[PDB]
Amino acid sequence: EWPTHTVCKEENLEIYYKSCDPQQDFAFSIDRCSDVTTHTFDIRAAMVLRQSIKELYAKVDLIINGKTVLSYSETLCGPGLSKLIFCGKKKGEHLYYEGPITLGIKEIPQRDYTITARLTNEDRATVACADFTVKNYLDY
């Protein structure tokens, strides 16, 4: 029941998200939509941390035609593996990020899919969770 937010709606590009964390919504935006088809784009994101992020792990699933075709896990904070200046934020802090997502992938996939992006912490608790809806026909 969280609202679906429009990140992009361009001629050949739509991106939407919805928070799948029942506790809260969050705010997300891409400075230039069409940079999602390069290997780096600049984002703005804000949310309230309900949990500490001493440790932070992203799990990223890609779902196509209802089927989870890819699953990927990265540590973002941790002992010796910290990737975000706002690692260490205690419970109750207002997280902010504006900065690039870089990318070992040279571009997000083409066409119609969903990316579920779930962040969790030292205790496996859900910090943030998004279903992103992508329709990407730009590289066309």
Coordinates of N, CA, C and O in Angstrom, one line a residue:
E1 N 0.8 -1.2 0.0 CA 0.0 0.0 0.0 C 0.8 1.3 0.0 O 0.3 2.4 0.1
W2 N 2.2 1.2 -0.1 CA 3.0 2.5 -0.3 C 2.7 3.0 -1.8 O 2.6 2.2 -2.7
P3 N 2.7 4.3 -1.9 CA 2.5 4.8 -3.3 C 3.7 4.4 -4.3 O 4.8 4.3 -3.8
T4 N 3.4 4.2 -5.5 CA 4.4 4.1 -6.6 C 4.9 5.5 -7.1 O 4.1 6.3 -7.5
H5 N 6.2 5.7 -7.0 CA 6.8 6.9 -7.3 C 7.4 6.9 -8.8 O 7.9 5.8 -9.2
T6 N 7.3 7.9 -9.5 CA 7.8 8.0 -10.9 C 9.2 8.7 -10.7 O 9.3 9.8 -10.2
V7 N 10.2 7.9 -11.0 CA 11.6 8.4 -11.2 C 11.8 9.0 -12.6 O 12.3 10.1 -12.8
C8 N 11.4 8.2 -13.6 CA 11.5 8.6 -15.0 C 10.2 8.3 -15.8 O 9.7 7.2 -15.6
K9 N 9.8 9.2 -16.7 CA 8.9 8.9 -17.7 C 9.2 9.8 -19.0 O 8.8 11.0 -19.1
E10 N 10.0 9.2 -19.8 CA 10.5 9.8 -21.0 C 10.0 9.0 -22.2 O 9.5 7.9 -21.9
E11 N 10.3 9.4 -23.4 CA 9.8 8.8 -24.6 C 10.0 7.3 -24.6 O 9.0 6.5 -24.8
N12 N 11.2 6.9 -24.4 CA 11.5 5.4 -24.5 C 12.1 4.9 -23.1 O 12.8 3.9 -23.1
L13 N 11.7 5.6 -22.0 CA 12.2 5.2 -20.7 C 11.2 5.6 -19.6 O 10.8 6.7 -19.5
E14 N 10.8 4.5 -18.9 CA 10.0 4.7 -17.7 C 10.8 3.9 -16.6 O 11.3 2.8 -16.8
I15 N 11.0 4.6 -15.5 CA 11.3 4.0 -14.2 C 10.4 4.4 -13.0 O 10.2 5.6 -12.8
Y16 N 9.9 3.4 -12.3 CA 9.0 3.6 -11.1 C 9.6 2.8 -10.0 O 10.3 1.8 -10.2
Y17 N 9.5 3.3 -8.8 CA 9.7 2.4 -7.6 C 8.5 2.4 -6.7 O 7.8 3.4 -6.7
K18 N 8.5 1.4 -5.9 CA 7.6 1.3 -4.7 C 8.4 0.7 -3.5 O 9.0 -0.4 -3.6
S19 N 8.4 1.3 -2.3 CA 9.0 0.7 -1.1 C 8.3 -0.6 -0.8 O 7.1 -0.6 -0.8
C20 N 9.0 -1.7 -0.7 CA 8.5 -3.0 -0.1 C 9.0 -3.2 1.3 O 8.8 -4.2 1.9
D21 N 9.5 -2.1 2.0 CA 9.6 -2.1 3.4 C 8.3 -1.5 4.0 O 8.0 -0.3 3.9
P22 N 7.6 -2.4 4.8 CA 6.3 -2.0 5.3 C 6.4 -0.8 6.3 O 5.4 0.0 6.4
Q23 N 7.5 -0.7 6.9 CA 7.8 0.4 7.9 C 7.7 1.8 7.3 O 7.2 2.7 7.9
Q24 N 8.2 2.0 6.1 CA 8.4 3.3 5.5 C 8.5 3.4 4.0 O 9.1 2.5 3.3
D25 N 8.2 4.6 3.5 CA 8.6 5.0 2.1 C 10.0 5.6 2.2 O 10.5 5.7 3.3
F26 N 10.6 5.9 1.1 CA 11.8 6.6 1.0 C 11.8 7.5 -0.3 O 11.0 7.2 -1.2
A27 N 12.7 8.4 -0.4 CA 12.7 9.3 -1.6 C 13.9 9.0 -2.5 O 15.0 8.9 -2.0
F28 N 13.7 8.9 -3.8 CA 14.7 8.6 -4.7 C 14.5 9.3 -6.0 O 13.4 9.5 -6.4
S29 N 15.6 9.7 -6.7 CA 15.5 10.5 -7.9 C 16.8 10.3 -8.7 O 17.8 10.2 -8.1
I30 N 16.7 10.5 -10.0 CA 17.9 10.4 -10.9 C 18.1 11.7 -11.6 O 17.1 12.2 -12.1
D31 N 19.2 12.3 -11.5 CA 19.4 13.7 -12.0 C 19.2 13.7 -13.5 O 18.6 14.7 -14.0
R32 N 19.7 12.7 -14.2 CA 19.5 12.6 -15.7 C 19.1 11.2 -16.0 O 19.9 10.3 -16.1
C33 N 17.8 11.0 -16.4 CA 17.3 9.6 -16.6 C 18.1 8.7 -17.5 O 18.4 7.6 -17.2
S34 N 18.5 9.3 -18.6 CA 19.1 8.6 -19.7 C 20.5 8.1 -19.3 O 21.0 7.2 -20.0
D35 N 21.1 8.6 -18.3 CA 22.4 8.1 -17.7 C 22.3 6.7 -17.2 O 23.3 6.1 -17.0
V36 N 21.1 6.2 -16.9 CA 20.9 4.8 -16.6 C 21.4 3.8 -17.7 O 21.4 2.6 -17.5
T37 N 21.7 4.3 -18.9 CA 22.1 3.4 -20.0 C 23.6 3.6 -20.2 O 24.2 3.2 -21.2
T38 N 24.3 4.3 -19.3 CA 25.7 4.3 -19.2 C 26.1 3.5 -17.9 O 25.3 2.9 -17.2
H39 N 27.4 3.5 -17.7 CA 28.0 2.8 -16.6 C 28.0 3.6 -15.2 O 28.3 3.0 -14.2
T40 N 27.5 4.8 -15.3 CA 27.3 5.6 -14.1 C 26.2 6.7 -14.2 O 26.0 7.3 -15.3
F41 N 25.3 6.8 -13.2 CA 24.3 7.8 -13.1 C 24.3 8.4 -11.7 O 24.5 7.6 -10.7
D42 N 23.8 9.6 -11.5 CA 23.9 10.4 -10.3 C 22.5 10.4 -9.7 O 21.5 10.6 -10.4
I43 N 22.4 10.0 -8.4 CA 21.2 9.8 -7.7 C 21.1 10.7 -6.5 O 22.1 11.3 -6.0
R44 N 19.8 10.9 -6.0 CA 19.5 11.5 -4.7 C 18.5 10.6 -4.0 O 17.5 10.2 -4.6
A45 N 18.8 10.3 -2.8 CA 18.0 9.4 -2.0 C 18.0 9.9 -0.6 O 19.0 10.4 -0.1
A46 N 16.8 9.8 0.1 CA 16.6 10.1 1.5 C 15.7 9.1 2.2 O 14.7 8.7 1.6
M47 N 16.0 8.7 3.4 CA 15.1 7.9 4.2 C 15.5 8.0 5.6 O 16.7 8.4 5.9
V48 N 14.6 7.5 6.5 CA 14.9 7.4 7.9 C 15.4 6.0 8.1 O 14.8 5.0 7.6
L49 N 16.6 5.8 8.7 CA 17.0 4.5 9.2 C 16.3 4.1 10.5 O 16.4 4.7 11.5
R50 N 15.5 3.1 10.3 CA 14.8 2.3 11.4 C 15.8 1.4 12.2 O 15.5 0.9 13.2
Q51 N 16.8 0.9 11.4 CA 17.9 0.0 12.0 C 19.2 0.8 11.9 O 19.4 1.6 11.0
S52 N 20.2 0.3 12.7 CA 21.6 0.7 12.5 C 22.1 0.1 11.2 O 21.7 -0.9 10.8
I53 N 23.1 0.8 10.7 CA 23.9 0.4 9.5 C 25.4 0.3 9.8 O 26.3 0.8 9.0
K54 N 25.8 -0.2 11.0 CA 27.1 -0.7 11.3 C 27.5 -1.6 10.1 O 28.5 -1.4 9.5
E55 N 26.6 -2.6 9.8 CA 26.8 -3.4 8.6 C 25.7 -3.2 7.6 O 24.5 -2.9 8.1
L56 N 25.9 -3.3 6.3 CA 24.9 -3.1 5.3 C 25.2 -3.9 4.1 O 26.3 -3.8 3.5
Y57 N 24.2 -4.7 3.7 CA 24.3 -5.6 2.5 C 23.1 -5.3 1.6 O 22.0 -5.3 2.0
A58 N 23.4 -5.2 0.3 CA 22.4 -5.1 -0.7 C 22.3 -6.5 -1.2 O 23.3 -7.1 -1.5
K59 N 21.0 -6.9 -1.4 CA 20.6 -7.9 -2.4 C 19.7 -7.4 -3.5 O 18.8 -6.8 -3.3
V60 N 20.2 -7.7 -4.8 CA 19.6 -7.1 -6.0 C 19.0 -8.3 -6.8 O 19.8 -9.1 -7.3
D61 N 17.7 -8.4 -6.9 CA 17.2 -9.4 -7.8 C 16.6 -8.7 -9.1 O 15.9 -7.7 -8.9
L62 N 16.8 -9.4 -10.3 CA 16.1 -9.0 -11.5 C 15.1 -10.0 -11.9 O 15.4 -11.2 -12.0
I63 N 13.9 -9.5 -12.2 CA 12.7 -10.4 -12.5 C 12.2 -10.0 -13.9 O 12.0 -8.8 -14.1
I64 N 12.1 -11.0 -14.7 CA 11.7 -10.8 -16.1 C 10.6 -11.8 -16.4 O 10.7 -13.0 -16.0
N65 N 9.5 -11.4 -16.9 CA 8.3 -12.2 -17.2 C 7.9 -13.0 -15.9 O 7.4 -14.2 -16.0
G66 N 8.0 -12.4 -14.8 CA 7.6 -13.0 -13.5 C 8.6 -13.9 -12.8 O 8.4 -14.4 -11.7
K67 N 9.7 -14.2 -13.5 CA 10.8 -15.1 -13.1 C 12.1 -14.4 -12.7 O 12.6 -13.5 -13.4
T68 N 12.6 -14.8 -11.5 CA 13.8 -14.2 -11.0 C 14.9 -14.8 -11.8 O 15.2 -16.0 -11.6
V69 N 15.5 -14.1 -12.7 CA 16.6 -14.6 -13.6 C 18.0 -14.3 -13.1 O 18.9 -15.0 -13.4
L70 N 18.1 -13.3 -12.2 CA 19.5 -12.9 -11.6 C 19.3 -12.6 -10.2 O 18.4 -11.7 -9.8
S71 N 20.3 -13.1 -9.4 CA 20.4 -12.6 -8.0 C 21.8 -12.2 -7.6 O 22.7 -13.0 -7.7
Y72 N 22.0 -11.1 -7.0 CA 23.3 -10.5 -6.7 C 23.3 -9.9 -5.3 O 22.5 -9.1 -5.0
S73 N 24.4 -10.2 -4.6 CA 24.7 -9.7 -3.3 C 26.0 -9.0 -3.1 O 27.0 -9.5 -3.5
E74 N 25.9 -7.8 -2.5 CA 27.1 -7.0 -2.2 C 27.1 -6.5 -0.8 O 26.1 -6.1 -0.3
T75 N 28.3 -6.5 -0.1 CA 28.4 -5.8 1.2 C 28.8 -4.4 0.9 O 29.6 -4.1 0.0
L76 N 28.0 -3.5 1.5 CA 28.2 -2.0 1.4 C 28.8 -1.4 2.6 O 29.6 -0.4 2.5
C77 N 28.5 -1.9 3.8 CA 29.3 -1.6 5.0 C 29.6 -2.9 5.9 O 28.7 -3.7 6.0
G78 N 30.7 -2.8 6.6 CA 31.3 -3.9 7.2 C 32.7 -3.7 7.6 O 33.3 -2.7 7.2
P79 N 33.3 -4.7 8.4 CA 34.7 -4.6 8.7 C 35.6 -4.8 7.5 O 35.6 -5.8 6.8
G80 N 36.3 -3.7 7.2 CA 37.2 -3.7 6.0 C 36.5 -3.6 4.6 O 37.2 -3.8 3.6
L81 N 35.2 -3.4 4.6 CA 34.5 -3.6 3.3 C 33.5 -2.5 3.1 O 32.5 -2.7 2.4
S82 N 33.9 -1.3 3.6 CA 32.9 -0.1 3.7 C 33.0 0.8 2.5 O 34.0 1.2 2.0
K83 N 31.8 1.2 1.9 CA 31.7 1.7 0.5 C 30.8 3.0 0.5 O 30.4 3.4 -0.6
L84 N 30.5 3.6 1.7 CA 29.5 4.6 1.8 C 29.9 5.4 3.0 O 30.1 4.9 4.1
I85 N 30.0 6.7 2.8 CA 30.6 7.5 3.9 C 29.6 7.5 5.1 O 30.1 7.6 6.3
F86 N 28.3 7.2 4.9 CA 27.3 7.1 5.9 C 27.0 5.7 6.5 O 26.1 5.5 7.2
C87 N 27.9 4.7 6.1 CA 28.1 3.6 7.0 C 28.4 4.1 8.5 O 29.0 5.1 8.7
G88 N 28.0 3.3 9.4 CA 28.1 3.6 10.8 C 26.9 4.4 11.4 O 26.7 4.4 12.6
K89 N 26.1 5.0 10.6 CA 24.8 5.7 11.1 C 24.0 4.8 12.0 O 23.6 3.7 11.6
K90 N 23.7 5.3 13.2 CA 22.9 4.7 14.2 C 21.4 4.6 13.8 O 21.0 5.4 12.9
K91 N 20.7 3.8 14.5 CA 19.2 3.8 14.4 C 18.6 5.2 14.7 O 18.8 5.8 15.7
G92 N 17.6 5.5 13.8 CA 17.0 6.8 13.8 C 17.6 8.0 13.1 O 17.0 9.1 13.0
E93 N 18.7 7.8 12.4 CA 19.3 8.9 11.6 C 18.6 9.0 10.3 O 18.0 8.1 9.8
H94 N 18.5 10.3 9.8 CA 18.0 10.5 8.5 C 19.2 10.4 7.5 O 20.1 11.3 7.5
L95 N 19.2 9.3 6.8 CA 20.2 9.0 5.7 C 19.9 10.0 4.6 O 18.7 10.2 4.2
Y96 N 21.0 10.5 4.0 CA 21.0 11.2 2.7 C 22.2 10.7 1.8 O 23.3 10.4 2.3
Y97 N 21.9 10.6 0.5 CA 22.9 10.3 -0.5 C 22.5 11.2 -1.7 O 21.5 11.1 -2.3
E98 N 23.5 11.9 -2.2 CA 23.5 12.3 -3.6 C 24.9 12.2 -4.2 O 25.9 12.5 -3.6
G99 N 24.9 11.4 -5.3 CA 26.2 10.8 -5.7 C 25.9 9.8 -6.8 O 24.7 9.5 -7.1
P100 N 26.9 9.3 -7.5 CA 26.7 8.3 -8.5 C 26.5 6.9 -8.0 O 27.2 6.5 -7.0
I101 N 25.6 6.2 -8.5 CA 25.8 4.7 -8.7 C 26.8 4.5 -9.9 O 26.4 4.7 -11.1
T102 N 28.0 4.0 -9.6 CA 28.8 3.3 -10.6 C 28.4 1.9 -10.8 O 27.3 1.5 -10.4
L103 N 29.1 1.1 -11.6 CA 28.6 0.0 -12.3 C 29.7 -0.8 -13.0 O 30.4 -0.2 -13.9
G104 N 30.1 -1.9 -12.5 CA 30.8 -3.0 -13.3 C 30.0 -3.5 -14.5 O 30.7 -3.7 -15.6
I105 N 28.7 -3.5 -14.5 CA 27.8 -3.6 -15.7 C 27.9 -2.2 -16.4 O 27.9 -1.2 -15.7
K106 N 28.0 -2.2 -17.7 CA 28.2 -1.0 -18.6 C 26.8 -0.2 -18.8 O 26.8 0.8 -19.5
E107 N 25.7 -0.8 -18.3 CA 24.4 -0.3 -18.5 C 23.4 -1.3 -17.9 O 23.7 -2.5 -17.8
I108 N 22.4 -0.8 -17.3 CA 21.2 -1.6 -16.9 C 20.6 -2.3 -18.1 O 20.7 -1.8 -19.2
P109 N 19.9 -3.4 -17.8 CA 19.3 -4.1 -19.0 C 18.3 -3.3 -19.8 O 17.7 -2.3 -19.3
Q110 N 18.0 -3.8 -21.0 CA 17.0 -3.3 -21.9 C 15.6 -3.8 -21.7 O 15.5 -4.9 -21.1
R111 N 14.6 -3.1 -22.0 CA 13.2 -3.5 -22.1 C 12.5 -3.5 -20.7 O 12.7 -2.6 -20.0
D112 N 11.7 -4.5 -20.4 CA 10.7 -4.5 -19.4 C 11.1 -5.5 -18.3 O 11.0 -6.7 -18.6
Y113 N 11.4 -5.0 -17.1 CA 11.7 -5.8 -16.0 C 11.5 -5.1 -14.7 O 11.3 -3.9 -14.6
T114 N 11.5 -5.9 -13.6 CA 11.6 -5.4 -12.2 C 12.9 -5.7 -11.5 O 13.5 -6.8 -11.7
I115 N 13.4 -4.7 -10.8 CA 14.6 -4.9 -9.9 C 14.1 -4.8 -8.6 O 13.6 -3.7 -8.2
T116 N 14.1 -5.8 -7.8 CA 14.0 -5.8 -6.3 C 15.4 -5.5 -5.6 O 16.3 -6.3 -5.9
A117 N 15.5 -4.4 -4.9 CA 16.7 -4.0 -4.2 C 16.5 -4.0 -2.8 O 15.8 -3.1 -2.3
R118 N 17.0 -4.9 -2.0 CA 16.8 -5.0 -0.6 C 18.0 -4.8 0.2 O 19.0 -5.5 0.0
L119 N 18.1 -3.7 1.0 CA 19.2 -3.5 1.9 C 18.8 -4.1 3.3 O 17.7 -3.9 3.8
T120 N 19.8 -4.8 3.9 CA 19.7 -5.4 5.3 C 20.9 -5.1 6.1 O 21.9 -4.5 5.6
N121 N 20.9 -5.4 7.4 CA 22.1 -4.9 8.3 C 22.8 -6.1 9.0 O 22.7 -7.2 8.6
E122 N 23.6 -5.7 10.0 CA 24.2 -6.7 10.9 C 23.3 -7.8 11.4 O 23.8 -9.0 11.4
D123 N 22.1 -7.5 11.7 CA 21.1 -8.5 12.1 C 20.2 -9.1 11.1 O 19.2 -9.7 11.4
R124 N 20.5 -8.8 9.8 CA 19.6 -9.3 8.7 C 18.2 -8.6 8.7 O 17.3 -9.0 8.0
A125 N 18.1 -7.5 9.5 CA 16.9 -6.7 9.5 C 16.8 -5.9 8.2 O 17.9 -5.5 7.7
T126 N 15.6 -5.6 7.7 CA 15.4 -4.8 6.5 C 15.6 -3.3 6.8 O 14.9 -2.8 7.7
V127 N 16.6 -2.7 6.2 CA 16.8 -1.3 6.3 C 15.9 -0.6 5.2 O 15.5 0.5 5.5
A128 N 16.0 -1.1 4.0 CA 15.2 -0.5 2.9 C 15.1 -1.6 1.9 O 15.8 -2.6 1.9
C129 N 14.0 -1.5 1.1 CA 13.6 -2.4 0.1 C 12.8 -1.7 -1.0 O 11.8 -1.0 -0.7
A130 N 13.2 -1.7 -2.3 CA 12.5 -1.2 -3.4 C 12.2 -2.3 -4.4 O 13.1 -3.1 -4.7
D131 N 10.9 -2.3 -5.0 CA 10.6 -2.9 -6.3 C 10.8 -1.7 -7.3 O 9.9 -0.8 -7.3
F132 N 11.8 -1.7 -8.1 CA 11.8 -0.8 -9.3 C 11.3 -1.4 -10.6 O 11.6 -2.6 -10.9
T133 N 10.4 -0.7 -11.3 CA 9.8 -1.1 -12.6 C 10.5 -0.4 -13.7 O 10.5 0.8 -13.7
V134 N 11.2 -1.2 -14.5 CA 11.9 -0.6 -15.6 C 11.3 -0.9 -17.0 O 10.9 -2.1 -17.3
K135 N 11.1 0.1 -17.8 CA 10.9 0.0 -19.2 C 11.9 0.8 -20.0 O 11.8 2.1 -20.1
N136 N 13.0 0.2 -20.5 CA 14.1 0.8 -21.1 C 14.2 0.4 -22.6 O 14.6 -0.7 -22.9
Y137 N 13.8 1.4 -23.4 CA 14.0 1.3 -24.9 C 14.9 2.4 -25.4 O 14.8 2.8 -26.5
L138 N 15.8 2.9 -24.6 CA 16.6 4.0 -25.0 C 17.7 3.6 -25.9 O 17.9 4.2 -27.0
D139 N 18.5 2.5 -25.6 CA 19.6 2.1 -26.4 C 19.1 1.7 -27.8 O 19.9 1.6 -28.8
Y140 N 17.8 1.5 -27.9 CA 17.1 1.7 -29.2 C 16.8 3.1 -29.5 O 16.1 3.4 -30.5

